[PDB]
Design a protein around this nucleic acid. Structure first.
Lengths: 52, 17, 200, 202, 96, 104
RNA sequence: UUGGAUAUGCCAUAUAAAGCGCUUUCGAAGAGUCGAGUUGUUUGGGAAUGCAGCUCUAAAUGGGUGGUAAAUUUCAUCUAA
RNA sequence: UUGACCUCAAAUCAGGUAGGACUACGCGCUGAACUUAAGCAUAUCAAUAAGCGCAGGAAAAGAAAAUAACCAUGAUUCCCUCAGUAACGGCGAGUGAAGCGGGAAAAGCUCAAAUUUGAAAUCUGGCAACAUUUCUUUUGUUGUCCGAGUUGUAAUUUCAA
């Protein structure tokens, strides 16, 4: 094995931003939160926003 | 008069003082 | 001053005066040792313009170097290889005889720093050189701001590493496109390095 | 032995290249090191800006002469026009470029007003506190570390907006003029020879 | 041509300035002391053997042969022509 | 020289005319660069050249220089005699530029 | 322990030194080195790219360089040893 | 005859300095062959390995005898780009830079060639005094002798002047 193997890998910034927006949208869906493994059966609202 | 001696004159006067 | 006259007279070294002086000086330099200490520079203005000051800590040595090309030290003139490497005779040392004169004097006086050197004479067997040397332990040198730089440890054996005037000449140091080989290992290493960035 | 589609291979890899592979795993480390050194310099050099003022110059080719970049230092001619001696310019943070010159009044003025803006906005502390000499500021309480780019940025020439069409522009064959000038320059050497040969013949 | 990329005076016209004369460009100008010293050295030293040979050829009026010898000795024809004019000035002054 | 500087320094301390208390020195001129410059400036009245300057180029031009500039010059025996005149071990050349009226 | 400021104390001969400004002025500038030929060795440098050996050896607006050799004439640029 | 000077010697003379190791990275010298070209001699490997010399915490390079042909740039180094390009090559295998442009970092200078000539103004050392300390371990100052130095040490100048 060599050190000059490719460890880091490039993603287009627009596609990185696509994924970030998609993940934020996913966080806004209660069904996806329960499916992923979050115990949100008793939380008041999604998205859960608290005061400053 | 020679200027460099004038500096030397001042140096020796300072030493004597 | 007389240094101007000395310089323009030294330009005329095919004159009868210089030819006679070349004869007598070359004779007496051959009668001395190959490396012998010079009491004073034989070209005081040449030494002066190259950096020699006439005070304690400055030394002049005369050395004669055998002229000609290099002889391959292979035994019996045999190379054991491809025919593009069979030359034995017409090969050339890549450093000048002025470099060779400097570095032999530098070994002779290991306690001194080789400042610079100049040609003084030549014949069919030798080229005679005078090497300007500086004592780095001498206080007259250590207290002179115009020559302290050579006391620093990064200037040990300037001539051996190629840092004297003729040494930089021999390894091709210069500004512009004509060189472009410049520092050879540095330039060769610069391109032959394969820069593999993280993101690629 | 090369039988596939594509271009003929050109890999310059017949030396010992693995000996000289350069990796960039220290790229984030060097970036942080440069940041820390830059901040160390910022704190150490006092109010003085971390970057000296630079002149506005034009790159030397047809590909780049329409742009303005930063030069090395201000010429001695520009410093004289701005009223700053070369001895004090290096002390107050104005670089000096003895090699450059002002072949045009436009380049001269461009950098002179740059020095004038720098001089107007510069607070020079007295060498001895409380004894303001010539050029020294009287109050230095408000001294701050500011950015020379913010105080005086490199400005690009902007093309004028719409302008009226005149008749001398209307009666101007651009392509014919281009062809005529190219031909005139091409054969100017032959014309000079012909005028010469005519003179001795006459 | 001014402001037309192609032509003889090609390029943008932006006024003009008279650049100050750089002291480095003065190099090559013959000085009074340098002229005096070189005259003294020429009297003290004399001429090289090839300079002597060229002067004889100029005296005997083989200008082409003297030019070819000087080019052979110096290496370039420009330096040869400069040496010929230098040595013929010596001849004229000595006749004077 | 040290005595004269001490005496004049005391004169300054006593606030008298230091610039006029002393008289113009009358002495021979020495040093190769200094003498050569004097000959070129036509200030030299007499030039004495050491016969055995070991690098002869240092003085070889001097007779021709003095002849052009109309300076009377002589080649005197030995470098050390010129040295002992100027309180040195060696003097390549000496120059007389001004003397006193009795020695004119 | 060190750093740059600050408070004053003392020592400090500006009898000095320095920048700037105009000169009808003057302005020294590195040689067996540059350059040339040649032979090696080098370079992407191809009518030699650099270096070295040998031979020849400058000059004073001179000497470099402007990537086709030569002579010639201009122009830029730079100021080696 | 005594002397002066030059040159060259001696001393377990007074005080210093050099080597050796290390060598990853620096500067040089010296220098191959296997290999590739489906053979092989130019070439390639490679201006590499081995050999040798000399450094530093970096080294080297460096304030243009530099580019460019522009409306011009402006020490060096490194990065990206130029660019697998111009070019070199049994024009085969192969090899192969630079100017620009963007960035990191920026910092400039010193002598030689000048008559201080109404003043060798310069400096090592011996001695004695003080002072100073990362330090009784360090580093200087002042005086006084001997010397060095006019065959040129200071001041002044470096072409941008």
């Amino acid at each position: 094995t060599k050190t000059w193997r490719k460890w880091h890998v490039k993603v287009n910034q627009n596609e990185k931003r696509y994924a970030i927006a998609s993940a934020v949208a996913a966080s806004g869906v209660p069904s996806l939160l329960l499916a992923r493994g979050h115990r949100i059966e008793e939380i008041p609202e999604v998205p859960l926003v608290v005061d400053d | 008069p020679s200027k460099h001696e004038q500096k030397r004159i001042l140096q020796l006067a300072y030493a004597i003082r | 001053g007389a240094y101007k006259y000395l310089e323009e007279l030294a330009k005329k070294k095919q004159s009868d005066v210089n030819l006679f002086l070349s004869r007598v000086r070359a004779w007496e330099y051959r009668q001395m040792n190959v490396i012998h200490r010079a009491s004073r520079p034989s070209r005081p203005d040449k030494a002066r313009r190259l950096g020699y000051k006439a005070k304690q800590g400055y030394v002049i040595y005369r050395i004669r170097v055998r002229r000609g090309g290099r002889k391959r030290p292979v035994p019996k003139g045999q190379t054991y290889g491809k025919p593009v490497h069979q030359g034995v005779n017409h090969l050339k040392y890549q450093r000048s005889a002025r470099c060779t004169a400097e570095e032999r004097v530098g070994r002779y006086c290991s306690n001194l720093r080789v400042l610079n050197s100049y040609w003084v004479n030549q014949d069919a067997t030798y080229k005679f050189f005078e090497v300007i040397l500086v004592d780095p332990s001498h206080k007259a040198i250590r207290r002179d701001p115009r020559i302290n730089w050579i006391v620093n440890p990064v200037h040990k054996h300037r001539e051996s590493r190629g840092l004297t005037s003729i040494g930089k000449k021999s390894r091709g140091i210069g500004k512009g496109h004509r060189f472009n080989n410049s520092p050879q290992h540095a330039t060769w290493l610069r391109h032959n390095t394969l820069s593999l960035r993280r993101y690629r | 032995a090369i039988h596939v589609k594509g271009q003929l291979p050109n890999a310059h890899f017949h030396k010992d290249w693995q000996r000289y592979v350069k990796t960039w795993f220290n790229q984030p480390g060097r970036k942080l090191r440069r940041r820390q050194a830059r901040q160390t310099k910022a704190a150490k050099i006092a109010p003085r800006p971390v970057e000296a003022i630079r002149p506005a110059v034009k790159p030397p080719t047809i590909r780049y002469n329409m742009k303005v970049r930063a030069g090395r230092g201000f010429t001695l001619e520009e410093l004289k026009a701005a009223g700053v001696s070369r001895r004090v310019a290096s002390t107050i943070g104005i670089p000096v470029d003895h090699r450059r010159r002002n072949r045009s009044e436009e380049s001269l003025q461009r950098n002179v007003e740059r020095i004038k803006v720098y001089l107007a906005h510069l607070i020079v502390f007295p060498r001895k506190a409380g004894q303001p000499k010539k050029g020294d500021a009287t109050d230095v309480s408000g001294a701050e570390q500011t950015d020379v780019a913010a105080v005086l940025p490199i400005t690009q020439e902007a093309v004028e907006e719409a302008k009226p069409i005149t008749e001398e522009a209307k009666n101007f064959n651009a392509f014919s003029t281009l062809s005529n000038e190219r031909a005139y320059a091409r054969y100017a050497g032959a014309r000079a020879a012909f005028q010469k040969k005519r003179a001795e013949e006459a | 041509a001014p402001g037309l990329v192609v032509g003889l005076n090609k390029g943008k016209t932006l006024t003009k300035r008279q650049l100050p004369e750089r002291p480095s460009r003065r190099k090559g100008h013959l000085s009074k002391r340098t002229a005096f010293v070189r005259s003294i050295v020429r009297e003290v030293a004399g001429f090289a053997p090839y300079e002597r040979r060229v002067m004889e050829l100029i005296r005997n009026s083989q200008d082409k042969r003297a030019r070819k010898l000087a080019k052979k000795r110096l290496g370039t024809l420009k330096r040869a022509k400069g040496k010929i004019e230098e040595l013929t000035s010596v001849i004229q002054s000595s006749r004077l | 020289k040290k005595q004269r500087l001490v005496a004049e320094a005391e004169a300054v301390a006593n606030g008298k005319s230091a610039q006029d208390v002393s008289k113009k020195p009358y002495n021979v001129k020495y040093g190769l660069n200094h003498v050569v410059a004097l000959i070129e400036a036509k200030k030299a009245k007499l030039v004495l050249i050491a016969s055995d300057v070991d690098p002869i180029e240092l003085v070889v031009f001097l007779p021709a220089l003095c002849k052009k500039m109309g300076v009377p010059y002589a080649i005197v025996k030995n470098k050390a005699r010129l040295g002992t005149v100027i309180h040195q071990k060696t003097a390549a050349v000496l120059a007389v530029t001004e003397v006193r009226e009795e020695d004119k």
